[PDB]
Ligand binder design. Structure first.
Ligand SMILES: CCCCCCCCCCCCCCCCCC(=O)OC[C@H](COP(=O)([O-])OCC(O)COP(=O)([O-])OC[C@@H](COC(=O)CCCCCCCCCCCCCCCCC)OC(=O)CCCCCCCCCCCCCCCCC)OC(=O)CCCCCCCCCCCCCCCCC
Ligand SMILES: CCCCCCCCCCCCCCCCCC(=O)OC[C@H](COP(=O)([O-])OCC(O)COP(=O)([O-])OC[C@@H](COC(=O)CCCCCCCCCCCCCCCCC)OC(=O)CCCCCCCCCCCCCCCCC)OC(=O)CCCCCCCCCCCCCCCCC
Ligand SMILES: CC(C)=CCC/C(C)=C/CC/C(C)=C/CC/C(C)=C/CC/C(C)=C/CC/C(C)=C/CC/C(C)=C/CC/C(C)=C/CC/C(C)=C/CC1=C(C)C(=O)c2ccccc2C1=O
Ligand SMILES: CC(C)=CCC/C(C)=C/CC/C(C)=C/CC/C(C)=C/CC/C(C)=C/CC/C(C)=C/CC/C(C)=C/CC/C(C)=C/CC/C(C)=C/CC1=C(C)C(=O)c2ccccc2C1=O
Ligand SMILES: CC(C)=CCC/C(C)=C\CC/C(C)=C/CC/C(C)=C/CC/C(C)=C/CC/C(C)=C/CC/C(C)=C/CC/C(C)=C/CC/C(C)=C\CC1=C(C)C(=O)c2ccccc2C1=O
Ligand SMILES: CCCCCCCC/C=C\CCCCCCCC(=O)OC[C@H](COP(=O)(O)OCCN)OC(=O)CCCCCCCCCCCCCCC
Ligand code: HEM
Ligand code: HEM
Ligand code: HEM
Ligand code: HEM
Ligand SMILES: CCCCCCCCCCCCCCCC(=O)OC[C@H](C)OC(=O)CCCCCCCC[C@@H](C)CCCCCCCC
Lengths: 535, 535
């Protein structure tokens, strides 16, 4: 008797505790059903997959520089001096069933985690989901993005490898040791001595399995709690105002679709872990200071820092008996990037002057300057990311390496400006398109007027029509407009039988009539709620 | 203008978010001010200190069996093959400034964590805090205790040492291989091979710094949330009923005293880490299968399992072509111990019939059978612990080793019975003493009657006095009774000046009558609330 068991367990729960009111509040909480609001959920799910795979990896990984001859199963690396970290990473890859798959899906989950954090940041920045409220949420999210970047940096550096060890030698050692006043001191504190210090990988292992992931988990908890109790903002729409949340309740629809999205995201990650090879450490021999490859790139999230290193024009300063290497330039650049990213909402509010409590998002077109600035920043980030890849770009796409380097150098001041101007004008022209649609109706097929040979597009007004043909122009309301009769009630009722065969006419008529009635009911409910709110 | 800054920050917080009602609820939450309710806080604080010191330790610890010659500073161990784990533990002890202190305070915090968990378990069990509302809390707390025990095991097993290594060899390896159908398979899965498998310490390091601490943190969060929302139970008292919490609010008093208690617990643990030497691994050479020591004990929280191993009388069964060693006996014993501990509240309610919502604690005297059973269990646990220590007990206290082993064997069935009987009768006699006080008043000095030579103790009634000398007996209300006029309004007004010199008589009188007024005001307020609840 499952129903009896469920009722008895509910009574027991509500007797031991009294969670009825709180649980009802959680279930009734309404969440907007916009697709762009699942971008953060992508990052959350990738983080969960990262945790689950990381536990499995920690069950088999041994962090240490203690030198060992492989004497394992991978023949091409046998009798070669390697660290225990590399040896156990190879053991995971080869001598543990499914270990290669687990580490590959872990690395793919890391890449998706970074990418989805970046896409979520784009969404919130361009839709203005940070101003007045949620500004602290944006701040902690920026901290979270930085932590994710460095977490992946320590992760793919964890198995002592030629590629990743070269990346460590470049960034962690050179940049740290070039910093003027305390650079060498920070280097020695971090590495326990010179660069190959015997504690680097154990320290990174601690940082990467417990310390940084613990902070990421705490900040994700704060992030999700803030989103939960500072009700999710929504785009302007029919019944959507600054003092309501139009969407679907947590229990029936939102919960099921979020769980299904989690399932699909982990399916994509597993499929990629299987079919796409990520970080073949067996190909990448053990780290040796004397050995190196030509690629020498970090993961795509640190690729912009690496590209900054490559592009910056070798400017070094030599004060009285001292040196200020080019590493400090990139270090200060990263510091500025992170400071600006963290402090943007406060910078934006100081500049514009808007401290009003904003709960309705604004379409990126409706804010030309901010969308222009975001496009400029994304252009700079892409420029740096491809500058880091200039080696392979030059190799495959036949362009001289010096040409790629100088293309990056010139573009990082030219391309951001070009993209800013183009994005600003593009946003304003999207606004102009919205206004033309508002004042003339949607466009359709052309008709030749009866008496004379006039051609008229035969528009379709979106609002009340004046006594004569032309309609009364509507006022923009911050919400998307239908620019194709395609997406309106025009040519959208195919025979509802099947792909191969029809259904009985009675069933088809019943189905289509019921669907039309449901559409009428939904639109009327939205219209009446909107009228009640604004009247 | 700190006041203005605080006001502006509060307004900004209440504008961005709306935490006014929730924060007021948290601040106004009332917590009973009984000392025994700080026992769980002791464990929580020791856990926090454990986290803080463990992060520092992981910054310097390298888990690996990779063999290395020390070549450090510690002269007595130079050129000796040791695992990198032992080498880095020695590096923490000697090479790192304050590393010895950090690891010692970490181990002392582990011992205090186990001890305070045990004391808190005793408190709740004997006071009946596990009844209907909080059996789930009891269950998760039992899981927490088990996790704490095993994490301490893995923690003092992390630095591969002679003592910890032989303890691992005995408990983990032997008792795992002993298990009949899957013992050897479990051993091979855990160690990745034979006992000295080269993944054991990395696996334990992961389990100990990330996995088990994560589960313990989640369970402590659930525990504290349950205590917070299922308002803390309280002992019977003047104004205390099953539907109220008499105590102090969170903000002014409880928060301050809890923070101060955490400070003092940290101070005790730091003082111990300084003055008392805990696990001096340097005296203990690196683990070798051949080297041994006479002591060979685990930490006190696993000493009971070790004592079970020692005492259980070598009963092995040999099915058709197989063996069932004596280790499986102890494995089943531990299983039974944990199962009974976790399932006691449900066992208690099945036995007694209590399905009532209990919010008033029971005095251990007021619940004899449960008090007797708890005393019996504590006696068994102490017998097992001292049986594990029987080696050192025999060495120092001159008792034959065989004599101690057989004392343990006989007493593990005799001492529990003796302690059960004694505790049951002791509880009933405490009840009898309480009723004697209720019916005769508190006892005082003797007086010789005027006409004849009778001697009367000159009692002091605690309630209304009959028309004649003898008082009207009061009804027992589950609250402690004052058996000394010491603790009542008698002999409690020393000169309030100072230790060496007095104060002006006007000041002394003002202070003393102010205190008298305050204490009688408190008594009257409690009395009025008690009368108001029913009257
Ligand atoms: C970790 C990462 C993983 C993801 C986790 C994050 C998830 C966050 C989502 C939040 C959801 C939530 O908390 O809902 C709970 C929600 C609590 O809030 P509520 O009920 O709305 O109370 C009124 C408002 O809270 C009153 O609030 P308000 O609306 O007036 O606004 C005030 C708000 C102001 O807004 C804020 O500032 C909120 C943001 C908090 C900041 C950071 C705190 C979170 C840090 C998390 C760190 C994790 C590590 O302050 C808060 O409410 C703070 C609450 C903090 C809880 C955060 C939880 C995480 O309700 C429940 O408790 C429902 C669940 C019931 C549980 C019992 C079920 C049966 C019991 C069985 C037990 C055992 C069975 C055996 C038999
Ligand atoms: C980790 C270990 C470390 C220790 C952590 C554990 C501490 C737990 C203590 C709980 C205290 C608590 O949650 O109070 C919050 C409490 C939420 O509860 P409430 O407000 O009473 O809401 C009505 C009741 O919750 C309605 O509940 P009810 O009284 O009707 O009974 C229903 C109850 C049923 O009872 C239960 O079953 C509760 C037990 C929950 C089971 C396990 C959940 C917890 C798991 C934790 C795992 C951690 C890892 O269900 C719940 O309430 C579940 C709530 C779950 C929250 C647990 C938090 C942990 O109020 C607040 O949120 C106050 C704090 C406000 C925060 C905002 C401050 C300013 C914002 C600034 C943001 C950034 C500034 C930048 C500018
Ligand atoms: C720092 C910086 C940007 C320096 C400049 C160097 C650079 C990137 C130049 C552009 C690269 C191109 C497009 C070369 C082709 C020749 C060329 C320049 C033609 C004119 C360009 C132009 C304006 C054309 C008009 C129409 C148009 C927009 C055409 C674009 C055509 C292309 C190539 C589109 C895709 C862009 C693209 C993927 C460029 C390479 C960038 C990267 C990082 C590829 C990564 C990558 C590589 C490198 C693999 O080898 C590989 C092997 C197996 C599986 C996967 C991959 C993989 O994903
Ligand atoms: C399994 C099992 C319990 C087997 C029996 C072995 C055993 C514990 C026998 C009892 C030990 C005793 C009390 C020996 C003294 C001789 C004796 C038996 C006298 C008769 C006992 C009796 C009924 C006396 C009447 C009055 C009475 C109650 C006297 C008790 C006297 C004592 C010793 C009280 C304290 C109890 C106690 C600490 C016993 C030893 C237990 C342990 C584990 C001590 C651990 C310990 C040791 C071993 C150190 O060397 C040490 C060195 C430096 C700093 C700290 C320590 C430290 O903590
Ligand atoms: C060789 C080898 C080892 C292979 C394995 C690889 C490995 C190591 C690990 C991966 C293996 C596993 C275990 C994969 C599956 C992971 C997993 C749990 C998937 C669940 C998805 C699934 C099976 C769905 C079935 C379809 C179905 C009926 C769905 C509805 C019922 C379900 C499952 C609902 C789940 C709801 C859900 C995702 C809860 C997540 C809980 C968390 C952390 C947060 C909740 C939460 C969410 C989800 C928000 O979006 C949100 C947005 C704004 C503010 C707050 C929140 C918030 O608090
Ligand atoms: C990849 C790209 C790089 C990354 C890009 C992200 C960084 C943030 C982006 C842009 C910041 C500059 C914005 C433009 C600032 C406008 C200047 C001005 O002239 O002030 C006019 C305003 C309007 O006032 P109004 O009553 O509307 O009158 C209309 C008059 N025509 O005045 C004010 O309130 C504000 C005056 C002071 C503003 C100070 C803002 C900067 C604070 C320091 C942070 C560092 C900035 C880094 C810059 C890159
Ligand atoms: C681990 C990284 C992250 C996780 C797990 C995460 C998760 C989420 C989720 C699930 C939401 C609600 C759904 C949505 O708005 O799409 C959200 C909202 C938000 N995120 Fe994040 N995000 C992350 C990174 C970031 C970054 C880098 C920023 C900057 C940021 C700022 C915000 C803001 C301001 C909101 C509020 C949006 C709203 O209220 O509509 N987050 N986050
Ligand atoms: C929080 C976000 C995280 C990110 C972005 C991340 C990223 C990465 C990446 C990219 C790798 C390289 C894998 C490879 O090269 O095969 C890695 C390795 C590893 N990660 Fe993480 N990780 C995260 C969290 C975790 C967690 C929570 C754990 C433990 C529970 C963990 C444990 C490990 C281990 C043990 C390795 C070494 C595997 C190997 O050497 O192949 N990671 N991580
Ligand atoms: C990590 C281990 C533990 C921590 C951090 C912890 C913490 C706490 C704290 C602070 C309290 C409230 C204060 C008090 O009642 O003394 C509490 C209550 C409680 N604990 Fe634990 N405790 C732990 C172990 C245990 C164990 C081993 C049991 C069994 C248990 C069962 C309970 C129960 C039933 C309560 C409710 C008592 C009440 O309502 O007053 N806990 N715990
Ligand atoms: C939660 C309860 C915990 C308990 C009961 C516990 C217990 C112990 C004990 C008794 C030791 C032996 C120390 C020595 O022999 O000097 C130890 C070692 C260690 N603990 Fe834990 N610990 C806990 C949590 C943690 C956490 C959270 C971390 C990491 C953040 C950690 C990291 C370490 C490390 C790295 C060692 C080895 C250091 C050494 O060998 O000296 N512990 N643990
Ligand atoms: C850990 C749980 C331990 C479970 C043991 C499962 C024993 C399976 C093999 C028994 C066997 O027949 O082997 C031959 C036998 C050794 O020789 C004899 O035929 C005469 C032996 C007379 C003593 C009988 C005592 C039985 C007590 C147990 C039934 C109680 C278990 C609780």
């Amino acid at each position: 008797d499952f129903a009896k068991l469920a009722a008895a367990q509910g009574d027991a729960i509500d007797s031991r505790y009294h969670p009825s009111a709180a649980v009802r509040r959680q279930l009734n909480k309404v969440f907007p059903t916009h697709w762009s609001f699942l971008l953060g959920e992508i990052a959350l799910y990738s983080f969960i997959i990262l945790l689950l795979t990381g536990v499995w990896l920690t069950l088999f990984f041994d962090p240490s520089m203690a030198h060992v001859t492989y004497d394992g199963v991978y023949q091409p690396l046998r009798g070669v001096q390697m660290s225990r970290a590399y040896e156990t990473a190879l053991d995971i890859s080869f001598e543990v069933r499914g270990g290669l798959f687990v580490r590959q899906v872990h690395h793919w989950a890391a890449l998706m985690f970074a990418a989805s954090i970046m896409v979520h940041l784009a969404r919130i920045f361009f839709t203005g989901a940070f101003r007045r409220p949620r500004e602290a949420n944006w701040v902690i999210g920026s901290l979270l993005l930085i932590l994710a970047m460095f977490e992946g940096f320590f992760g793919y550096s964890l198995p002592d490898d030629l590629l990743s060890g070269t990346g460590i030698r470049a960034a962690l050692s050179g940049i740290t040791m070039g910093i003027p006043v305390i650079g060498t001191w920070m280097h020695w504190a971090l590495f326990g001595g010179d660069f190959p210090g015997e504690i680097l990988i154990p320290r990174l292992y601690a940082l990467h399995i417990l310390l940084i992931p613990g902070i990421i988990l705490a900040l994700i908890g704060a992030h999700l709690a803030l989103v939960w109790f500072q009700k999710h903002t929504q785009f302007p729409g029919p019944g959507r105002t600054e003092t309501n949340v139009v969407g679907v309740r947590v229990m029936p629809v939102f919960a099921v679709k979020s769980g299904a999205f989690f399932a699909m995201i982990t399916g994509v990650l597993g499929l990629m872990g299987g079919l796409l090879t990520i970080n073949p450490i067996w190909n990448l021999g053990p780290y040796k200071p004397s050995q190196v490859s030509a690629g020498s790139q970090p993961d795509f999230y640190m690729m912009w820092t690496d590209g900054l290193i490559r592009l910056w024009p070798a400017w070094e300063f030599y004060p009285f008996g001292h040196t200020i290497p080019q590493g400090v330039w990139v270090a200060v650049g990263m510091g500025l990037v992170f400071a600006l990213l963290i402090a943007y909402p406060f910078i934006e509010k100081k500049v514009t002057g808007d401290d009003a409590h904003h709960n309705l998002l604004q379409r990126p077109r409706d804010v030309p300057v901010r969308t222009a600035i975001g496009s400029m920043a994304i252009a700079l980030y892409l420029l740096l990311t491809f500058a880091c890849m200039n080696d392979i770009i030059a190799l495959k796409f036949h362009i001289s390496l010096n040409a790629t380097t100088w293309i990056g150098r010139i573009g990082m001041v030219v391309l951001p400006a070009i993209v800013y101007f183009v994005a600003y004008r593009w946003a304003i022209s999207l606004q102009r398109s919205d206004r033309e649609v508002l004042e003339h109706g949607v466009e359709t097929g052309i008709i030749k007027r009866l008496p004379h040979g006039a051609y008229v597009e035969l528009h379709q007004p979106l609002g009340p029509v004046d006594e004569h043909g032309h309609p009364i122009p509507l006022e923009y309301a911050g919400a998307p407009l239908p620019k194709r009769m395609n997406k309106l009630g025009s040519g959208g009722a195919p025979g509802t039988g099947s792909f191969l065969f029809p259904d009985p006419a009675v069933e088809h008529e019943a189905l289509t009539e019921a669907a039309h009635a449901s559409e009428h009911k939904s639109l009327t409910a939205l219209k009446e709620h909107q009228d009640r709110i604004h009247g």
